[PDB]
Amino acid sequence: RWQEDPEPEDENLYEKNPDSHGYDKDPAVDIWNMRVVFFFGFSIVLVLGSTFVAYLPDYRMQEWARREAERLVKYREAHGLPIMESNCFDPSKIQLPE
Amino acid sequence: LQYGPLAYILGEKATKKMTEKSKLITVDGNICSGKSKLAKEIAEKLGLKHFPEAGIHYVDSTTGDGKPLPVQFSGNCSLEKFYDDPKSNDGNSYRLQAWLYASRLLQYADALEHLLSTGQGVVLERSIYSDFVFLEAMYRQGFIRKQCVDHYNQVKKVTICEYLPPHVVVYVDVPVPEVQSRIQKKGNPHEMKITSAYLQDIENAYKGTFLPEMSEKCEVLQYSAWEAQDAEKVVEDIEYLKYDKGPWLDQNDRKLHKLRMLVQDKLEVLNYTSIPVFLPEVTVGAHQSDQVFQEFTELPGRKYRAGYNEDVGDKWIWLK
Amino acid sequence: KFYIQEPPHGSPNWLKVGLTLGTSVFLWIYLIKQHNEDVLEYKRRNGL
Amino acid sequence: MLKYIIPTIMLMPLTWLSKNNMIWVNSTAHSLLISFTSLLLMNQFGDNSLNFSLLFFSDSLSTPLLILTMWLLPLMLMASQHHLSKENLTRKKLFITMLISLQLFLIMTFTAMELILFYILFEATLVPTLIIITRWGNQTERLNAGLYFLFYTLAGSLPLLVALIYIQNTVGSLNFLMLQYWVQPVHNSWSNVFMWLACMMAFMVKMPLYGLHLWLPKAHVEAPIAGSMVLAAVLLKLGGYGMLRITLILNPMTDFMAYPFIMLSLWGMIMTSSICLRQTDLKSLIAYSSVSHMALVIVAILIQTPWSYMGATALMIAHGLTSSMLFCLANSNYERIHSRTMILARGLQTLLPLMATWWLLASLTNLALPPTINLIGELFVVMSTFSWSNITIILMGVNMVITALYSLYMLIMTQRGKYTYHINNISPSFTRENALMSLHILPLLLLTLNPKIILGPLY
Amino acid sequence: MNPIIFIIILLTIMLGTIIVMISSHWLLVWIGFEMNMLAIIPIMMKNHNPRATEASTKYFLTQSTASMLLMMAVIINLMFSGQWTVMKLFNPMASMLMTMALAMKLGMAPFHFWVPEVTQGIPLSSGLILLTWQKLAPMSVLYQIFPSINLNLILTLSVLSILIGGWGGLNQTQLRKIMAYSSIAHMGWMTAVLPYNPTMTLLNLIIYIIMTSTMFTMFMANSTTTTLSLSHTWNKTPIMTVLILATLLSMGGLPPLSGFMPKWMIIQEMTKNNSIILPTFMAITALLNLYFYMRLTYSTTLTMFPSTNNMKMKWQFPLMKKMTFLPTMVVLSTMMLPLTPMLSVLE
Amino acid sequence: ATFQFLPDEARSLPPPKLTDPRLAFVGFLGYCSGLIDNAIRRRPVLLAGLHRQLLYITSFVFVGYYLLKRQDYMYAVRDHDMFSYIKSHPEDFPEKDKKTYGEVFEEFHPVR
Ligand SMILES: CCCCCCCCCCCCCCCCCC(=O)OC[C@H](COP(=O)(O)OCCN)OC(=O)CCCCCCCCCCCCCCCCC
Ligand SMILES: CCCCCCCCCCCCO[C@@H]1O[C@H](CO)[C@@H](O[C@H]2O[C@H](CO)[C@@H](O)[C@H](O)[C@H]2O)[C@H](O)[C@H]1O
Ligand SMILES: CCCCCCCCCCCCO[C@@H]1O[C@H](CO)[C@@H](O[C@H]2O[C@H](CO)[C@@H](O)[C@H](O)[C@H]2O)[C@H](O)[C@H]1O
Ligand SMILES: CCCCCCCCCCCCO[C@@H]1O[C@H](CO)[C@@H](O[C@H]2O[C@H](CO)[C@@H](O)[C@H](O)[C@H]2O)[C@H](O)[C@H]1O
Ligand SMILES: Nc1nc2c(ncn2[C@@H]2O[C@H](COP(=O)(O)OP(=O)(O)OP(=O)(O)O)[C@@H](O)[C@H]2O)c(=O)[nH]1
Ligand SMILES: N=C(N)NC(=N)NCCc1ccc(I)c(Cl)c1
Ligand SMILES: [Mg+2]
């Protein structure tokens, strides 16, 4: 009917570049794209990122809370107090209705 | 000061630069009528600017470096293909015709812009007023479809109505047997494939439709082939014309200012030559037009507006 | 000479260029003067 | 957040001022660097959130969502650069600009302090996403997919705008830190019922809730690979993040208003899991799998327990990597056979051995094999819904069976059996494709070693 | 038209508007409308064709009828208060008559039928004036008389306009008719908020004018008046297709674009007044506008429609139309949301 | 005042800084307008007519500064009017008696 270009044939990157990493037709650009993805993706973000996460300074106070709980359990048991009380807040500071 | 309302206000009125020598002349005729040679002699003798007939590459001649561009940037219109295979399924026949009418429309605008800006008359070979004779010949011979003719008339209707007709129409009447003999002598292999029936169709349209129509509104001079050889007599005939017809008598500075604002803006000239009428002969798919447009922008001096192309030597782009 | 017809913007419009830069300079000088005058009037009115 | 917003913005001049042949190298390298710096948001405190300024804050919910967002941009660039190879330069840079702009809107969305600022960026994400789908999708149906995506979102989001503006008039502030302290209970009235619906429906549509999910299978089947990745990985989680925040100010009305949506989700997850068993389009199967997984997240958010909120956070992050990986796996086949029909190319394990391994690992995370964070998230929701009502275990357990069947049906159909005889263009897996799959699965599995960073504030 | 005459006629259109805006006397307001209508007709007629003559006649009949009703309102007001000051009116029947007259002048529903037809029948530059500058004078009177307008009447007009504008635009392929129905819808937002906060009326008017001028200017740049003709822009001026896309999305009220700001602010003012149903109904109904804006983006920017062969000839020539202020207006039309607090200058 | 952009009383307020972030954005908008001007006329976008691009930035900044001045003045007036009205009518804005949460009763809604 109209004047339209035919659908182009699918191009196999390996044909012209058997060493193609699949990033670019240009072999030099292709290699550099591979290197940045691998160096920044795996060497930097994943390895150093995993290391950074592994050594986070007591994430969200979990380790401090355990040390603090140990201190309170030690103190309360020695002085004969309950380990925990049902009332979070001192009743003398509360006024009830009615 | 590029022409506009401000230039018009400050005194650039067309009637100032125009004279009784400021005339628009068109030479018409069948193929191989020596109308090209007559047109040059009239222009030389009357001191007018001559326009060679607008072909497939006329627009290229007016833009860029002026040299022709590859074929794909004219859509692949081939006059040679028209002769070899006038019935090709690719639609080359009407695509060429639609392109050529647009090329003539652009040329008519250039000629009118020259006449109105400088006051010097012009000589054209055929015009948008006579382009239809080839369309009629194409249709009657079955080269184009009825739908193509309808499209052509739609485009002509909204374009030709904007422009004044020629002052003088010159017709060189050569009979088809003599036309057919001059063609075989010219020795162009594709042109010799032209048939007398096609040539008779052009003649019939010229005499049946064109000349009667232009006679109402223009000065029509008809010469046989022999008489056209006497260019001095032809020029003599032109200079003794009364000019008592047509719309050129109704024009004034206000109307000619409106006309000049149109012809100088070429995109405004060509606006309706691309009306969205989806005729298969002239319709181009998105993938092709996208690809061709991208190649066009890569041609030398075409990526940017003229004067802003460093790749062809433009300077001071950062102060322009 | 590459272009067949001389482009309307072949050469810079030096008058327009001069006016354009001159206008930009004026607005900046005016703006800084206005700001300076505004700062002082503010300091004076508030006693600072 | 300026240390992330500004470098994200700088990716745009970087892409536009790059040499023609280095747009993918430059944009990929520097978006990976931005992702690296995102780990600085892990400075979270047990009591207080990380409150940068009057505009932006980060807590344990938004932090993992931010790191996922900034991780996905480089992956999307790698995934897109092959099918965009023949595109002209300016239109490539425009495509990358839309991806960068989406990341900019997303990081600001997840850290906005004020709910109306959140709304505007929440809504700005529609524009680049819609453009990506309708301009760079391959099929005619992308135009209709754009419209369904657009008007499903705005149908719910415009009522949300009215509700939020009404709340600020009544309370005086939409700042989330302020709302934590000035929140008042919601009383039973028809006025509050529609306030509740206006506050939640926009987020339900984005999850998507069962019954309002029809736009999603359209959007995926039509979107390009990068559009599918961000749609599945992050954009669905706008809805989950939205509810997790806004439910603060809807109590105790959520006690009963949740019932219709828990029912739709509990039944919906079984319906959409069953649907996956009969899907013929591989991309449509993965899309329906997302609907089923997000049904758990909706249930988890609606029942509002510490265990359900932790499971919801882990599920959102885990599904982000799994689902995006599955789309990338399906796309890699599509780039060879140029069809999404699942049954067209079979026995691919014979032809692409290593790729079949990525298929196996993505399937095992999709069906939540322990101890993947996929399983951790789902299990925490199962534990909390059982306390909500013991009978939910029947529905949750049945959905686990169906999820295994369709996860492995997809694996068996495409990877095993006999290869199709006439499909002879299955070229070996490119280094780019293998790296793309590893950058999904490796962080996903590494998170199993330290799950707390993706469990959210309730941890 | 002689260029000097064109300038003087344009200056008289503006002077008529300015007289309305600076007048403190109802008679001078009426004169401003009469002067303005006298000068607008020639620019509607300037292309001399039956469609332009029909458009000018329909415009004349509508505007002259509305101006007689306005004069009647003024005279009733004179009898019941003995003064001419431009302010609240002192008679409910005078208030209704003036409100209906201004609604007819604005082309608000159900007095809207003339807007799509007149806009279609006149050139783009004339339609730009009709749908932007011509809204200034009637809005500036509503700004002053609103303390006495009937709330039910004005809100009924607003609701009908948003509905008719949204529905009417769904069925249009002509660009001039689309802008006309878009204008009817936008007038509805301007007047809906007027009883509550007139400053938001001014904000919506200003942003409406900027966005509307941008669309008309981009249509003029390419001489496009139909949807299909606009769909060829991608193959001639790709930059224009992107600017149209941004402007259309802004006109659709999508954040983070400028056109979201008026809808955002109007919803806020209405809710502060415990108006909840009306803003919600308005915002949902405005999705009809977004739909036929999106349709245009599809055929202009987001897909590539078929071209013609003669289009290649256009590649060799540059845009020569003035496109005055287009770069400035397109930026304002899309990138102003971060400066929203600036609306207080309109107080 | 009356039909005055910046009345004389606005001069008692601190002027906007020339490094105001909002003024930087206004300048950025002017720069974007300069680039679009190049694009729509098919000139080299970044390089063409730096004189024209400079005036685009300057014009936006110049107008933006005065608009920002009026904006801040109007908001200062809004606050001035509000506080003066609160003083004029102390009966309508009494100091609420504040109770601590120990005294205020709030119903508890368990999530079980
Ligand atoms: C700052 C705070 C406020 C934030 C609000 C959001 C601001 C964004 C809105 C700004 C206004 C829009 C300005 C966009 C400028 C567009 C310029 C551009 O990107 O390139 C156009 C491109 C040029 O093509 P060409 O003329 O041929 O030159 C290169 C040779 N090939 O032309 C083409 O090649 C055609 C491209 C095909 C069409 C693709 C369209 C998708 C890309 C849309 C980009 C614009 C975004 C508009 C929507 C807003 C997004 C937020
Ligand atoms: C007074 C305010 C003015 C502010 C102006 C600030 C910016 C001025 C920039 C001037 C330099 C522009 O530079 C001009 O455009 C681009 C971008 O560099 C260059 O060419 C470009 O080609 C490709 C992209 O197409 C890329 O490799 C790279 O972007 C550049 O090399 C042109 O060869 C150069 O002529
Ligand atoms: C997951 C890895 C992320 C990689 C991110 C890459 C970008 C790194 C940005 C480094 C920013 C460092 O920024 C700067 O560091 C120095 C340490 O020398 C700090 O120096 C200060 O630290 C603390 C501050 O309480 C004090 O001991 C003392 O005031 C001083 O030592 C500065 O407070 C900080 O401004
Ligand atoms: C997917 C669709 C989801 C649909 C969800 C539908 C939830 C329906 C919630 C019903 C509860 C609505 O809120 C309820 O309305 C009734 C009125 O009928 C209110 O009733 C109120 O007015 C009546 C007067 O008739 C008084 O008698 C009553 O004292 C008072 O509470 C209640 O204050 C409120 O408890
Ligand atoms: N199909 C078609 N061919 C055209 C058209 N105009 C010119 N031509 C062809 O252009 C060719 C040369 O044109 P002519 O000027 O008439 O021939 P010529 O011999 O060189 O010049 P003359 O001697 O003056 O007649 C002819 O073969 C024509 O067929 C047209 O509008 N349509
Ligand atoms: N008419 C209305 N409903 N609104 C309105 N204009 N209220 C007046 C209050 C106000 C608000 C902002 C500013 I800045 C200023 Cl100076 C005054
Ligand atoms: Mg010849």
PDB file of N, CA, C and O in Angstrom, chain E residues 16-17 19-23 25-26 28-30 32-33 70 74 86-89 98-99 101-102 105-106 135-149 194 198 201-202 205:
ATOM      1  N   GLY E  16     -10.997  49.220  25.592  1.00  0.00           N
ATOM      2  CA  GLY E  16     -12.299  48.837  26.101  1.00  0.00           C
ATOM      3  C   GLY E  16     -12.192  47.982  27.347  1.00  0.00           C
ATOM      4  O   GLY E  16     -12.932  48.176  28.309  1.00  0.00           O
ATOM      5  N   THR E  17     -11.259  47.031  27.351  1.00  0.00           N
ATOM      6  CA  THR E  17     -11.053  46.218  28.542  1.00  0.00           C
ATOM      7  C   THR E  17     -10.547  47.063  29.704  1.00  0.00           C
ATOM      8  O   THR E  17     -11.025  46.924  30.831  1.00  0.00           O
ATOM      9  N   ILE E  19     -10.945  50.223  30.309  1.00  0.00           N
ATOM     10  CA  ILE E  19     -11.998  51.088  30.825  1.00  0.00           C
ATOM     11  C   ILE E  19     -12.877  50.320  31.801  1.00  0.00           C
ATOM     12  O   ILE E  19     -13.271  50.846  32.846  1.00  0.00           O
ATOM     13  N   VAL E  20     -13.197  49.069  31.479  1.00  0.00           N
ATOM     14  CA  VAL E  20     -13.976  48.245  32.395  1.00  0.00           C
ATOM     15  C   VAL E  20     -13.229  48.054  33.709  1.00  0.00           C
ATOM     16  O   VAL E  20     -13.827  48.096  34.789  1.00  0.00           O
ATOM     17  N   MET E  21     -11.914  47.852  33.640  1.00  0.00           N
ATOM     18  CA  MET E  21     -11.128  47.535  34.826  1.00  0.00           C
ATOM     19  C   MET E  21     -10.863  48.743  35.714  1.00  0.00           C
ATOM     20  O   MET E  21     -10.709  48.578  36.923  1.00  0.00           O
ATOM     21  N   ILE E  22     -10.789  49.951  35.157  1.00  0.00           N
ATOM     22  CA  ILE E  22     -10.524  51.134  35.972  1.00  0.00           C
ATOM     23  C   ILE E  22     -11.785  51.917  36.311  1.00  0.00           C
ATOM     24  O   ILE E  22     -11.716  52.845  37.129  1.00  0.00           O
ATOM     25  N   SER E  23     -12.925  51.575  35.724  1.00  0.00           N
ATOM     26  CA  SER E  23     -14.139  52.352  35.925  1.00  0.00           C
ATOM     27  C   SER E  23     -14.707  52.138  37.319  1.00  0.00           C
ATOM     28  O   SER E  23     -14.682  51.031  37.857  1.00  0.00           O
ATOM     29  N   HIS E  25     -17.867  53.617  37.606  1.00  0.00           N
ATOM     30  CA  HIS E  25     -19.219  53.985  37.217  1.00  0.00           C
ATOM     31  C   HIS E  25     -19.771  52.918  36.281  1.00  0.00           C
ATOM     32  O   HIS E  25     -19.097  52.522  35.328  1.00  0.00           O
ATOM     33  N   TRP E  26     -20.997  52.464  36.542  1.00  0.00           N
ATOM     34  CA  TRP E  26     -21.563  51.386  35.736  1.00  0.00           C
ATOM     35  C   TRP E  26     -21.687  51.791  34.274  1.00  0.00           C
ATOM     36  O   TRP E  26     -21.515  50.961  33.378  1.00  0.00           O
ATOM     37  N   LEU E  28     -19.673  53.679  32.561  1.00  0.00           N
ATOM     38  CA  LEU E  28     -18.373  53.539  31.919  1.00  0.00           C
ATOM     39  C   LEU E  28     -17.990  52.080  31.740  1.00  0.00           C
ATOM     40  O   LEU E  28     -17.308  51.739  30.771  1.00  0.00           O
ATOM     41  N   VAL E  29     -18.409  51.209  32.655  1.00  0.00           N
ATOM     42  CA  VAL E  29     -18.217  49.778  32.457  1.00  0.00           C
ATOM     43  C   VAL E  29     -18.953  49.324  31.206  1.00  0.00           C
ATOM     44  O   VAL E  29     -18.410  48.597  30.369  1.00  0.00           O
ATOM     45  N   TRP E  30     -20.205  49.747  31.065  1.00  0.00           N
ATOM     46  CA  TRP E  30     -20.990  49.388  29.893  1.00  0.00           C
ATOM     47  C   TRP E  30     -20.338  49.911  28.621  1.00  0.00           C
ATOM     48  O   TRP E  30     -20.308  49.217  27.601  1.00  0.00           O
ATOM     49  N   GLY E  32     -17.147  50.418  28.139  1.00  0.00           N
ATOM     50  CA  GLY E  32     -15.986  49.595  27.864  1.00  0.00           C
ATOM     51  C   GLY E  32     -16.341  48.318  27.133  1.00  0.00           C
ATOM     52  O   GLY E  32     -15.636  47.902  26.216  1.00  0.00           O
ATOM     53  N   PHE E  33     -17.441  47.679  27.527  1.00  0.00           N
ATOM     54  CA  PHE E  33     -17.875  46.478  26.831  1.00  0.00           C
ATOM     55  C   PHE E  33     -18.304  46.794  25.407  1.00  0.00           C
ATOM     56  O   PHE E  33     -18.004  46.034  24.482  1.00  0.00           O
ATOM     57  N   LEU E  70     -27.104  43.646  30.826  1.00  0.00           N
ATOM     58  CA  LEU E  70     -26.277  44.351  31.795  1.00  0.00           C
ATOM     59  C   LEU E  70     -26.800  45.759  32.035  1.00  0.00           C
ATOM     60  O   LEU E  70     -26.894  46.204  33.181  1.00  0.00           O
ATOM     61  N   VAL E  74     -28.085  47.497  35.516  1.00  0.00           N
ATOM     62  CA  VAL E  74     -27.590  48.772  36.018  1.00  0.00           C
ATOM     63  C   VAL E  74     -28.744  49.714  36.328  1.00  0.00           C
ATOM     64  O   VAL E  74     -28.731  50.416  37.341  1.00  0.00           O
ATOM     65  N   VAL E  86     -19.697  51.110  40.892  1.00  0.00           N
ATOM     66  CA  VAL E  86     -19.403  49.713  40.594  1.00  0.00           C
ATOM     67  C   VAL E  86     -19.036  49.024  41.904  1.00  0.00           C
ATOM     68  O   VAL E  86     -17.995  49.304  42.499  1.00  0.00           O
ATOM     69  N   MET E  87     -19.902  48.123  42.354  1.00  0.00           N
ATOM     70  CA  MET E  87     -19.746  47.428  43.623  1.00  0.00           C
ATOM     71  C   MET E  87     -20.877  46.419  43.740  1.00  0.00           C
ATOM     72  O   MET E  87     -21.490  46.061  42.732  1.00  0.00           O
ATOM     73  N   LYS E  88     -21.182  45.970  44.949  1.00  0.00           N
ATOM     74  CA  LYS E  88     -22.355  45.132  45.148  1.00  0.00           C
ATOM     75  C   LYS E  88     -23.597  45.839  44.628  1.00  0.00           C
ATOM     76  O   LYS E  88     -23.736  47.056  44.752  1.00  0.00           O
ATOM     77  N   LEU E  89     -24.501  45.070  44.039  1.00  0.00           N
ATOM     78  CA  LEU E  89     -25.786  45.592  43.613  1.00  0.00           C
ATOM     79  C   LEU E  89     -26.788  45.522  44.759  1.00  0.00           C
ATOM     80  O   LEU E  89     -26.657  44.709  45.676  1.00  0.00           O
ATOM     81  N   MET E  98     -27.349  40.813  35.990  1.00  0.00           N
ATOM     82  CA  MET E  98     -25.941  41.073  35.724  1.00  0.00           C
ATOM     83  C   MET E  98     -25.137  39.781  35.691  1.00  0.00           C
ATOM     84  O   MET E  98     -24.230  39.633  34.868  1.00  0.00           O
ATOM     85  N   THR E  99     -25.447  38.839  36.582  1.00  0.00           N
ATOM     86  CA  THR E  99     -24.735  37.566  36.580  1.00  0.00           C
ATOM     87  C   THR E  99     -24.997  36.789  35.296  1.00  0.00           C
ATOM     88  O   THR E  99     -24.070  36.237  34.697  1.00  0.00           O
ATOM     89  N   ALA E 101     -25.845  38.086  32.414  1.00  0.00           N
ATOM     90  CA  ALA E 101     -25.193  38.815  31.333  1.00  0.00           C
ATOM     91  C   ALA E 101     -23.703  38.509  31.285  1.00  0.00           C
ATOM     92  O   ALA E 101     -23.140  38.275  30.213  1.00  0.00           O
ATOM     93  N   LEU E 102     -23.040  38.516  32.439  1.00  0.00           N
ATOM     94  CA  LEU E 102     -21.618  38.203  32.458  1.00  0.00           C
ATOM     95  C   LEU E 102     -21.368  36.748  32.090  1.00  0.00           C
ATOM     96  O   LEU E 102     -20.350  36.438  31.467  1.00  0.00           O
ATOM     97  N   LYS E 105     -21.439  36.681  28.372  1.00  0.00           N
ATOM     98  CA  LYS E 105     -20.210  37.251  27.835  1.00  0.00           C
ATOM     99  C   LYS E 105     -19.047  36.277  27.965  1.00  0.00           C
ATOM    100  O   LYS E 105     -18.204  36.186  27.069  1.00  0.00           O
ATOM    101  N   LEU E 106     -18.982  35.545  29.072  1.00  0.00           N
ATOM    102  CA  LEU E 106     -17.917  34.575  29.279  1.00  0.00           C
ATOM    103  C   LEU E 106     -18.132  33.284  28.507  1.00  0.00           C
ATOM    104  O   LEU E 106     -17.199  32.489  28.401  1.00  0.00           O
ATOM    105  N   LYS E 135     -11.730  37.396  28.285  1.00  0.00           N
ATOM    106  CA  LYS E 135     -12.248  36.973  29.578  1.00  0.00           C
ATOM    107  C   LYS E 135     -11.925  37.968  30.680  1.00  0.00           C
ATOM    108  O   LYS E 135     -12.538  37.912  31.746  1.00  0.00           O
ATOM    109  N   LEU E 136     -10.992  38.886  30.441  1.00  0.00           N
ATOM    110  CA  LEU E 136     -10.522  39.766  31.503  1.00  0.00           C
ATOM    111  C   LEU E 136     -11.626  40.690  32.005  1.00  0.00           C
ATOM    112  O   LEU E 136     -11.851  40.796  33.214  1.00  0.00           O
ATOM    113  N   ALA E 137     -12.311  41.383  31.100  1.00  0.00           N
ATOM    114  CA  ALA E 137     -13.289  42.380  31.530  1.00  0.00           C
ATOM    115  C   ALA E 137     -14.469  41.772  32.275  1.00  0.00           C
ATOM    116  O   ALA E 137     -14.818  42.285  33.349  1.00  0.00           O
ATOM    117  N   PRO E 138     -15.142  40.737  31.773  1.00  0.00           N
ATOM    118  CA  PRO E 138     -16.253  40.168  32.551  1.00  0.00           C
ATOM    119  C   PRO E 138     -15.812  39.585  33.880  1.00  0.00           C
ATOM    120  O   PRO E 138     -16.547  39.687  34.867  1.00  0.00           O
ATOM    121  N   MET E 139     -14.624  38.982  33.943  1.00  0.00           N
ATOM    122  CA  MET E 139     -14.137  38.456  35.213  1.00  0.00           C
ATOM    123  C   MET E 139     -13.850  39.578  36.197  1.00  0.00           C
ATOM    124  O   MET E 139     -14.086  39.428  37.400  1.00  0.00           O
ATOM    125  N   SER E 140     -13.336  40.707  35.712  1.00  0.00           N
ATOM    126  CA  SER E 140     -13.036  41.828  36.591  1.00  0.00           C
ATOM    127  C   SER E 140     -14.293  42.473  37.156  1.00  0.00           C
ATOM    128  O   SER E 140     -14.213  43.150  38.184  1.00  0.00           O
ATOM    129  N   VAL E 141     -15.444  42.290  36.513  1.00  0.00           N
ATOM    130  CA  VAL E 141     -16.696  42.763  37.090  1.00  0.00           C
ATOM    131  C   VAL E 141     -17.215  41.768  38.118  1.00  0.00           C
ATOM    132  O   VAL E 141     -17.673  42.160  39.192  1.00  0.00           O
ATOM    133  N   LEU E 142     -17.161  40.473  37.806  1.00  0.00           N
ATOM    134  CA  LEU E 142     -17.531  39.462  38.788  1.00  0.00           C
ATOM    135  C   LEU E 142     -16.691  39.601  40.045  1.00  0.00           C
ATOM    136  O   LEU E 142     -17.193  39.422  41.158  1.00  0.00           O
ATOM    137  N   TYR E 143     -15.413  39.937  39.884  1.00  0.00           N
ATOM    138  CA  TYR E 143     -14.533  40.139  41.027  1.00  0.00           C
ATOM    139  C   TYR E 143     -15.079  41.186  41.985  1.00  0.00           C
ATOM    140  O   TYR E 143     -14.829  41.109  43.190  1.00  0.00           O
ATOM    141  N   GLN E 144     -15.816  42.167  41.475  1.00  0.00           N
ATOM    142  CA  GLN E 144     -16.272  43.288  42.282  1.00  0.00           C
ATOM    143  C   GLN E 144     -17.694  43.140  42.795  1.00  0.00           C
ATOM    144  O   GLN E 144     -18.004  43.661  43.868  1.00  0.00           O
ATOM    145  N   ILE E 145     -18.572  42.455  42.062  1.00  0.00           N
ATOM    146  CA  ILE E 145     -19.971  42.336  42.447  1.00  0.00           C
ATOM    147  C   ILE E 145     -20.265  41.045  43.189  1.00  0.00           C
ATOM    148  O   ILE E 145     -21.416  40.821  43.576  1.00  0.00           O
ATOM    149  N   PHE E 146     -19.264  40.196  43.412  1.00  0.00           N
ATOM    150  CA  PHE E 146     -19.534  38.885  43.989  1.00  0.00           C
ATOM    151  C   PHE E 146     -20.203  38.939  45.359  1.00  0.00           C
ATOM    152  O   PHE E 146     -20.973  38.012  45.659  1.00  0.00           O
ATOM    153  N   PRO E 147     -19.989  39.941  46.214  1.00  0.00           N
ATOM    154  CA  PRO E 147     -20.680  39.927  47.510  1.00  0.00           C
ATOM    155  C   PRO E 147     -22.189  39.841  47.389  1.00  0.00           C
ATOM    156  O   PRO E 147     -22.847  39.464  48.362  1.00  0.00           O
ATOM    157  N   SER E 148     -22.758  40.159  46.227  1.00  0.00           N
ATOM    158  CA  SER E 148     -24.200  40.144  46.044  1.00  0.00           C
ATOM    159  C   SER E 148     -24.688  39.097  45.054  1.00  0.00           C
ATOM    160  O   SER E 148     -25.886  39.068  44.761  1.00  0.00           O
ATOM    161  N   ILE E 149     -23.817  38.237  44.528  1.00  0.00           N
ATOM    162  CA  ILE E 149     -24.277  37.207  43.609  1.00  0.00           C
ATOM    163  C   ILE E 149     -25.002  36.111  44.381  1.00  0.00           C
ATOM    164  O   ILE E 149     -24.677  35.804  45.533  1.00  0.00           O
ATOM    165  N   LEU E 194     -15.054  31.752  43.178  1.00  0.00           N
ATOM    166  CA  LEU E 194     -15.267  33.185  43.372  1.00  0.00           C
ATOM    167  C   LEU E 194     -16.016  33.516  44.655  1.00  0.00           C
ATOM    168  O   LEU E 194     -15.594  34.441  45.364  1.00  0.00           O
ATOM    169  N   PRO E 198     -11.900  35.283  45.921  1.00  0.00           N
ATOM    170  CA  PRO E 198     -11.666  35.812  44.569  1.00  0.00           C
ATOM    171  C   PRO E 198     -10.206  35.803  44.146  1.00  0.00           C
ATOM    172  O   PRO E 198      -9.934  35.821  42.944  1.00  0.00           O
ATOM    173  N   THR E 201      -9.669  33.018  42.037  1.00  0.00           N
ATOM    174  CA  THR E 201     -10.219  33.267  40.710  1.00  0.00           C
ATOM    175  C   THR E 201      -9.181  33.942  39.825  1.00  0.00           C
ATOM    176  O   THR E 201      -8.971  33.538  38.679  1.00  0.00           O
ATOM    177  N   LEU E 202      -8.496  34.954  40.357  1.00  0.00           N
ATOM    178  CA  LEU E 202      -7.449  35.616  39.590  1.00  0.00           C
ATOM    179  C   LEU E 202      -6.310  34.661  39.269  1.00  0.00           C
ATOM    180  O   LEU E 202      -5.800  34.655  38.146  1.00  0.00           O
ATOM    181  N   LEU E 205      -7.388  32.415  36.523  1.00  0.00           N
ATOM    182  CA  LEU E 205      -7.496  33.161  35.277  1.00  0.00           C
ATOM    183  C   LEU E 205      -6.123  33.394  34.660  1.00  0.00           C
ATOM    184  O   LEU E 205      -5.925  33.177  33.462  1.00  0.00           O
TER     185      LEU E 205
END
